[PDB]
């Protein structure tokens, strides 16, 4: 299991010249020890596929994921949570390529497995609901999208913390859902909430002598990587309202924090 934890670490740094031969050589060892149809082979195929996807090698990523899926269905079972993790990775892959119609049934199968096996309260259910809502909104099917978001948000803040990265990602996705629907005020409210929580976690509780960035922006007008896209998207919302001095305050903060709207959907892996 140690090796699985080592590759993700090398991949996170963007060391593809080291991460890819690590997976390949590990898969070479496993196929000589326990053959092709073994759970550890499917685990390594799954991680390498995600490494390929990050390198824009989608053809390769799809091939390994479909292979890992067939292995996991055989070696672990059709209703195993590891099958749902691979089904999700396939849905996310199709979703990232615009194949929302093809991605939706895979996402629904993964959700059904995770609800039945882990319970309707598990963080992995919130993961699938978030991805399902993302695949639905990009099709223009808004019917149950906001319901999935508020359901996933409840699970994430309860099981993990309200400061957990999955909470901010799901919130940014719901705010993108509001933008696609022309709900500019609700998107503004949600982006302000993310920035308030980020301000409270670092500089403390909000008062007169300690205000979040968006509060200082509105004063001037009167006279985590997710936060950068939150700062940019709220800045663009102010620009649309004709509030340019408020828009400048956020752009200044987005520049310092780094080193129409920003379309970046946060899909949650495995």
């Amino acid at each position, epitope marked *: 299991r140690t090796l699985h934890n080592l590759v993700i670490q090398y991949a996170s740094q963007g060391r593809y010249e080291v991460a890819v031969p690590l997976c390949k050589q590990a898969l070479e060892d496993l196929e000589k020890t326990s053959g092709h149809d073994h759970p550890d082979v499917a685990t390594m195929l799954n991680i390498l596929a995600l490494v390929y996807r990050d390198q824009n090698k989608y053809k390769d990523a799809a091939n390994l994921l479909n292979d890992a899926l067939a292995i996991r269905e055989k070696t672990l079972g059709r209703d195993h949570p590891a099958v749902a993790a691979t089904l999700n990775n396939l849905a996310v892959l199709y979703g990232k390529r615009g194949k929302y119609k093809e991605a939706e049934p895979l996402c629904k199968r993964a959700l059904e497995i995770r609800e039945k096996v882990l319970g309707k309260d598990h963080p992995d259910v919130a993961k699938q609901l978030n991805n399902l809502a993302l695949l639905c909104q990009n099709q223009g099917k808004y019917e149950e999208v906001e319901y999935y978001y508020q359901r996933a948000l409840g699970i994430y803040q309860t099981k993990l913390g309200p400061d957990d990265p999955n909470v901010a990602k799901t919130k940014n996705n719901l705010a993108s859902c509001y933008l696609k629907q022309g709900k500019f005020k*609700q998107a503004e409210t949600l982006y302000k909430e993310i920035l308030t929580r980020a301000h409270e976690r670092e500089f403390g509780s909000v008062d007169d002598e300690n205000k979040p960035i968006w509060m200082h922006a509105e004063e001037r007008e009167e006279c985590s990587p997710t936060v950068t896209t939150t700062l940019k998207n709220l800045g663009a919302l102010y620009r649309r309202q004709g509030k340019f001095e408020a828009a400048e305050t956020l752009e200044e903060a987005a520049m310092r924090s780094r080193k129409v709207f920003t379309k970046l959907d946060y899909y949650l892996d495995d």
Partner: nanobody
Amino acid sequence: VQLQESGGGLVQPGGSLRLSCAASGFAFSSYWMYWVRQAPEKGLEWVSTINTGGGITYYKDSVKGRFTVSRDNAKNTLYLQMNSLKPEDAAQYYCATDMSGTYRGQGTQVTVSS
């Protein structure tokens, strides 16, 4: 996490109740809050959702325009104004940090009769 519900009672169809939920032991203002209900012989149903500040609200289709969720972050309290109450709304009501009813209190009984 400590949530305590109050405000339940017996009313006639068309009547009103205001549910309260006292919160302690957590950063309440950083959480989205939920109202959930369980009718005598049915499973737990989601009723309403409110964001941290109260700028975003959501309701079950059958309670839209009759129910109003609100919150007082300084008082660490969640509210549910229930107007034009119907027999279908008769249930045990709970407040929660999710739709499943995790961290819910003992609830409060709502009865709609005569």
